[PDB]
Amino acid sequence: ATLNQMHRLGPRKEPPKRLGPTEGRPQLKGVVLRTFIRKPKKPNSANRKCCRVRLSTGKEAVCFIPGEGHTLQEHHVVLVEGGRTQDLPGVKLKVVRGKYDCGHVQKK
Amino acid sequence: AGSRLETVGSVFSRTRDLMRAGVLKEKPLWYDIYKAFPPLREPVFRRPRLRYGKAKADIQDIFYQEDQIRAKFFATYGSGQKAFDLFNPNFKSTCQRFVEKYTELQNLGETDEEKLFVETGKALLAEGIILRRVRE
Amino acid sequence: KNVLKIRRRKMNHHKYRKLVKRTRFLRRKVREGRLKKKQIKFEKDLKRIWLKAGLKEAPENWQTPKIYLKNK
Amino acid sequence: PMKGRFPIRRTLQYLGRGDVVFKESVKIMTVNYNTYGELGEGARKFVFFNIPQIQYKNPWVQIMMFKNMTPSPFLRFYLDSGEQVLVDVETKSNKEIMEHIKKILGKKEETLREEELEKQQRFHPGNFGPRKYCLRECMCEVEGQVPCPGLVPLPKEMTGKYKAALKAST
RNA sequence: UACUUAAAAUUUAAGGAGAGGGUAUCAAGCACAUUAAAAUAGCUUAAGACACCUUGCCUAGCCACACCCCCACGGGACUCAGCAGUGAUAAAUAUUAAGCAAUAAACGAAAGUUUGACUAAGUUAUACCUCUUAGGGUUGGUAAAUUUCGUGCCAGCCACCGCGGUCAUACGAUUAACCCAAACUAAUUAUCUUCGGCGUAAAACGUGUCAACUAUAAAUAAAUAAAUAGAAUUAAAAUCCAACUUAUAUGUGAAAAUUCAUUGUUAGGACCUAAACUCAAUAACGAAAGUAAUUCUAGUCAUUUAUAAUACACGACAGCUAAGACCCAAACUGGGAUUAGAUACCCCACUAUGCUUAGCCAUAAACCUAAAUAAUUAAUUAACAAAACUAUUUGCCAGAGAACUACUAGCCAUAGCUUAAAACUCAAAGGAC
Ligand code: FES
Ligand SMILES: [K+]
Ligand SMILES: [K+]
Ligand SMILES: [K+]
Ligand SMILES: [K+]
Ligand SMILES: [K+]
Ligand SMILES: [K+]
Ligand SMILES: [K+]
Ligand SMILES: [Mg+2]
Ligand SMILES: [Mg+2]
Ligand SMILES: [Mg+2]
Ligand SMILES: [Mg+2]
Ligand SMILES: [Mg+2]
Ligand SMILES: [Mg+2]
Ligand SMILES: [Mg+2]
Ligand SMILES: [Mg+2]
Ligand SMILES: [Mg+2]
Ligand SMILES: [Mg+2]
Ligand SMILES: [Mg+2]
Ligand SMILES: [Mg+2]
Ligand SMILES: [Mg+2]
Ligand SMILES: [Mg+2]
Ligand SMILES: [Mg+2]
Ligand SMILES: [Mg+2]
Ligand SMILES: [Mg+2]
Ligand SMILES: [Mg+2]
């Protein structure tokens, strides 16, 4: 672009930073609604443990539960955090182990 | 260990550099000779490029003043029936004798080209040279 | 130079043309209603002007032109 | 590569090299120059190289330039009194034009220095406060003075916590 | 605070050199002007008006707000956005504390009095500082550092690339190392922001003309090869009609259907529909699209040069509207073959349509995939294409797909064109060799 064209337009317009599943917040608190299994998109093979939750904002999201074995059930309370599960498409939230009803993984 | 880079610098500069580096401990025998009696131009690599646009070479067409007279003689009489001998360094052709006489008359002060061309033909005719005015 | 990018656009346009053909009658009714709402919005915007200016009736001999109807 | 011809003209150092600071009377400087010709070459160079420097040092002066309106280039200054100073810059180098206008309508070096000193009259080295305005924020920074309690803990007897305990003890 | 008249601090009102968030799919606002007999018809705006959305900024500090109704006569859902504290809510968690001793403010002539300002404390790894203890994470690559076993595409793991189906340095447990350390790791947020590009990768607009700026500096142009429009004209080959005439004609790789209302000849007649061989191995004209059978008429030409849209005029083919034309070609359709099928490729027939005259439509791989203009050819090989490269002006581009899409506005367009997003998905997509 010419110097006249750079002057008439100025600095590049910056698209706004749209928020993610946590809505620009470190964590959210949600109530478990259902516990189910999700299948990782190929080339991976597993039965990943997930749960649906109703977040404090009022929306409902799918959250991956990390660790080997959880005791979560419906009506439990959990603290979710950000971070996508790479193989699980659409799962953009995770549960925090050791907060509210969710507990630390039982060591073997 | 050497400098096989013939596109940067020259054989002399690369040999100068190798000795400064410390890799070449003995001067080549041709080195001091080049230092004392170098070439006119440094032998450095240059990539030939084509000329583009309106760039042109600088070569003068070699045309002496005798050629104006010689062109007329070949158009009027062609090449002399006597054959050119280009091995004799002092050969005098029929056309060269015409141009020598044509010059002599012009020194006298004749200003008309037509006068100098028809008078020269008469002079050579007296000399006995066989000039054929071959239009063909 | 392959034509792969042209083939993606080729399929999108082919499928889109068949979608419009299937729902041609529905799309016609959407348009006639979108134009009607477009006309009402035009009339209301003209009524806002004279009412704000303080007139209680539209200027004498004025009838809002119907500009979106099948006049041509 | 910086765009345009002579990109050095678009540097703060070049703009600050201008030496013509007009007197307060000068309000407008109209520049009439011709884009084609031989006697106007210095004028064209003056608009190219010098007009930016003049505007940088005289932000409140209106410089308006007109092209190819007259046979010869000239400069006309409009003063606040209503006087009009016409300058003829034909056959004159751009440097010569700058020197001419500096002499007739330029502030002297003495005047400019005096204004600079007056501007800084209210800054005092002894004054304490924020870094933007002062050298030192607190007297604790000075050598020999009691240091800041955050950096160096104060003696117990100089602390309100300790003094309060004694008053209760008394 | 001074004088009978002047120095400040602090404000208020009317303004304007310049600067000042986002969306142009917000493009028009609709009285937003001037004059001063009261007329004139103006004012703002692509150099961004107006509309909408978001946000405290100018930081020794400033601005706005003070239960709500912008305001607060009034009305109402009737007061901690003063200190501490509570309910609810939230990922978010300080004392319902002491003193007016210091400074500040208020009052008083004053000794003085008052103050949840403030001072000194309480609370909290949020930060810094001094000490003392040691914990936290990591160990496939990027990136410092793994022993053994268990598991066997399961259980699990990853910021990216990826790991796990029997010897897993990548999972879990151990072992040893590595990093940081009173912290350590996770999530969230913020800090880095245009002098780069546009033949083939995103990107030069289908074409030209007129403005205002920014640049440039010359004084010409045109001067019968196919621009364009109108009228007239016609050689070849078809078609129709007629005479004569084979028995078949037509068609394919081979067949079938079709046909004998055919076929072949005509130095016979009519027709002027449609299209213009050779020339053309040419490279002209025109802004582009486009234009080449012949003749005649009208006609291209000077702005220094580049640079234009929201205006104007054009714009292959296909398509639409009305009235005509019709030799041949031909979507569709019907008939015949082929094939597992053949809604096709091949055969035959015949429409819309290609033609004229009016109007619309405004799209092309509208592509030399090269914006225009003026220089230079050396002080220059990413690859390929079409050698490199400077300057000027405008346009355009900012990972891929979603998307020649949704919505918006304009349009003779109505299954349309131009304008043109986001969610969401992916870690690539793409160009050359
Ligand atoms: S900053 Fe000076 S005493 Fe703390
Ligand atoms: K795998
Ligand atoms: K208020
Ligand atoms: K006090
Ligand atoms: K093993
Ligand atoms: K491990
Ligand atoms: K381990
Ligand atoms: K092309
Ligand atoms: Mg598609
Ligand atoms: Mg929209
Ligand atoms: Mg109020
Ligand atoms: Mg309140
Ligand atoms: Mg109050
Ligand atoms: Mg409070
Ligand atoms: Mg906190
Ligand atoms: Mg007092
Ligand atoms: Mg792990
Ligand atoms: Mg790892
Ligand atoms: Mg492209
Ligand atoms: Mg069929
Ligand atoms: Mg037909
Ligand atoms: Mg187009
Ligand atoms: Mg073309
Ligand atoms: Mg299209
Ligand atoms: Mg569309
Ligand atoms: Mg649309």
Side-chain angles (χ1 to χ4, degrees):
Chain A
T2 65
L3 292 163
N4 307 339
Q5 287 177 329
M6 289 171 76
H7 173 81
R8 289 190 295 267
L9 274 163
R12 300 282 312 285
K13 297 300 186 178
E14 196 62 49
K17 281 176 170 174
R18 180 181 168 85
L19 303 168
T22 58
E23 309 192 3
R25 297 167 65 183
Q27 294 95 12
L28 295 173
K29 196 166 74 173
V31 188
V32 176
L33 307 180
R34 303 192 299 279
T35 299
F36 50 84
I37 297 300
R38 281 279 174 88
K39 275 271 160 175
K41 65 205 187 83
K42 300 186 68 182
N44 294 346
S45 296
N47 294 271
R48 309 227 164 277
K49 279 64 177 168
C50 298
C51 59
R52 178 168 291 275
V53 297
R54 185 193 170 281
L55 304 176
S56 55
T57 55
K59 294 194 165 190
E60 291 183 359
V62 175
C63 306
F64 172 70
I65 305 148
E68 287 178 351
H70 64 86
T71 73
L72 294 175
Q73 319 182 356
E74 183 176 3
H75 300 290
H76 281 218
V77 172
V78 295
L79 186 75
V80 300
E81 62 185 341
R84 73 188 202 93
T85 307
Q86 295 92 333
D87 52 20
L88 298 180
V91 181
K92 309 181 180 181
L93 291 173
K94 292 213 294 168
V95 184
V96 174
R97 304 301 302 258
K99 187 63 151 177
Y100 304 141
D101 291 88
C102 192
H104 286 290
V105 168
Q106 300 307 315
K107 288 187 166 174
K108 184 181 176 179
Chain B
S3 304
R4 305 186 178 188
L5 297 148
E6 81 289 332
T7 47
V8 61
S10 74
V11 298
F12 172 86
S13 77
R14 291 193 296 270
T15 307
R16 182 183 64 206
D17 288 359
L18 282 167
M19 286 189 287
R20 272 198 297 169
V23 188
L24 181 48
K25 308 314 300 172
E26 176 52 43
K27 281 180 188 183
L29 67 80
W30 66 265
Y31 190 82
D32 286 305
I33 302 159
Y34 186 111
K35 208 165 175 176
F37 314 108
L40 290 170
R41 195 193 81 90
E42 195 84 358
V44 178
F45 176 88
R46 294 143 59 201
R47 193 165 307 279
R49 293 177 195 281
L50 294 182
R51 284 189 182 83
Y52 290 97
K54 302 150 53 175
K56 306 290 173 189
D58 179 12
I59 311 293
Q60 73 188 344
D61 294 14
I62 298 170
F63 285 120
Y64 302 104
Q65 204 75 75
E66 300 87 277
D67 296 327
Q68 294 289 353
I69 303 156
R70 278 200 274 270
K72 299 159 189 176
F73 178 89
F74 293 136
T76 305
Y77 313 97
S79 64
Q81 297 287 264
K82 80 187 292 186
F84 278 88
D85 179 54
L86 305 177
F87 288 89
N88 172 20
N90 300 93
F91 180 71
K92 318 294 187 183
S93 56
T94 299
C95 181
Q96 182 54 34
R97 297 187 79 183
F98 188 106
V99 178
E100 288 169 317
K101 293 284 189 182
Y102 185 106
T103 304
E104 287 171 18
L105 299 180
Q106 186 173 356
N107 290 336
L108 305 183
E110 292 175 33
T111 301
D112 185 11
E113 294 177 350
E114 289 294 341
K115 288 175 203 173
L116 289 154
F117 203 80
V118 171
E119 283 288 356
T120 301
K122 292 158 166 174
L124 294 195
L125 179 58
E127 292 212 313
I129 291 149
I130 301 162
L131 299 186
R132 302 160 187 180
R133 187 183 299 273
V134 174
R135 197 185 184 279
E136 182 178 1
Chain C
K1 182 66 189 299
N2 52 24
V3 298
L4 279 169
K5 287 179 249 185
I6 302 161
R7 285 175 47 74
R8 169 167 39 75
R9 282 168 55 89
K10 185 179 173 52
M11 190 54 76
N12 293 329
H13 187 69
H14 173 57
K15 286 173 70 160
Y16 172 75
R17 287 325 305 178
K18 290 182 78 176
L19 170 64
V20 172
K21 181 174 166 158
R22 285 199 306 276
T23 74
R24 72 165 157 281
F25 311 99
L26 178 63
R27 289 169 179 275
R28 167 165 285 182
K29 288 168 63 168
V30 167
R31 196 193 288 199
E32 73 187 356
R34 273 180 187 169
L35 290 177
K36 283 169 209 173
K37 289 197 298 287
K38 209 160 157 159
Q39 177 67 18
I40 291 155
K41 180 175 173 173
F42 176 65
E43 288 178 14
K44 284 173 175 175
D45 182 283
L46 289 201
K47 180 156 176 175
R48 188 184 44 76
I49 296 281
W50 78 62
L51 290 175
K52 206 156 285 181
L55 305 185
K56 299 168 186 174
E57 167 63 51
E60 294 178 351
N61 292 337
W62 177 260
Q63 306 180 97
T64 302
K66 295 174 201 300
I67 55 162
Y68 304 113
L69 205 47
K70 191 183 176 191
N71 290 34
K72 309 303 188 195
Chain D
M2 280 181 75
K3 293 171 173 285
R5 302 161 292 180
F6 291 97
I8 197 167
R9 296 178 299 152
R10 301 194 289 101
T11 69
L12 285 179
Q13 200 188 345
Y14 176 93
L15 286 161
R17 284 175 164 92
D19 57 346
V20 186
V21 181
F22 292 136
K23 300 170 192 296
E24 297 173 38
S25 51
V26 179
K27 293 277 149 285
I28 318 179
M29 177 180 63
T30 59
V31 182
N32 272 80
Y33 71 103
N34 300 324
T35 61
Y36 55 104
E38 298 79 30
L39 302 189
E41 190 58 63
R44 286 187 290 270
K45 287 170 171 174
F46 173 82
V47 170
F48 191 89
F49 289 107
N50 302 135
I51 287 283
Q53 290 174 319
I54 291 157
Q55 190 68 78
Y56 185 74
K57 300 285 191 203
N58 306 314
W60 288 75
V61 179
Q62 172 176 10
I63 303 176
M64 204 161 174
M65 310 195 265
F66 308 89
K67 307 200 310 186
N68 302 307
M69 287 193 71
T70 53
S72 50
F74 57 89
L75 300 173
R76 182 146 49 190
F77 299 83
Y78 295 76
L79 307 185
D80 189 75
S81 61
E83 178 172 2
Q84 300 181 2
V85 189
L86 183 74
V87 178
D88 180 24
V89 296
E90 193 171 57
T91 306
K92 255 176 179 182
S93 176
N94 66 318
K95 183 157 279 164
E96 291 173 15
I97 296 162
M98 277 281 269
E99 287 171 5
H100 180 110
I101 63 167
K102 188 172 180 294
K103 164 168 181 172
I104 61 161
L105 293 165
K107 291 183 174 178
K108 313 313 185 197
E109 184 178 344
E110 290 181 344
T111 296
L112 297 162
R113 291 163 47 78
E114 290 163 42
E115 290 163 0
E116 290 295 341
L117 296 155
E118 286 171 329
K119 180 182 173 182
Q120 301 159 20
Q121 278 176 7
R122 303 315 188 190
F123 164 80
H124 198 267
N127 281 15
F128 294 88
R131 303 297 177 185
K132 169 174 186 177
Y133 306 100
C134 303
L135 303 170
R136 297 160 289 185
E137 290 179 349
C138 188
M139 183 62 82
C140 69
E141 299 175 33
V142 179
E143 181 187 12
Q145 303 301 104
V146 164
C148 175
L151 304 185
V152 178
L154 281 163
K156 292 179 182 180
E157 286 60 55
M158 290 184 64
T159 302
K161 189 184 195 171
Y162 174 88
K163 295 165 193 170
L166 294 181
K167 292 309 191 184
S169 299
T170 53

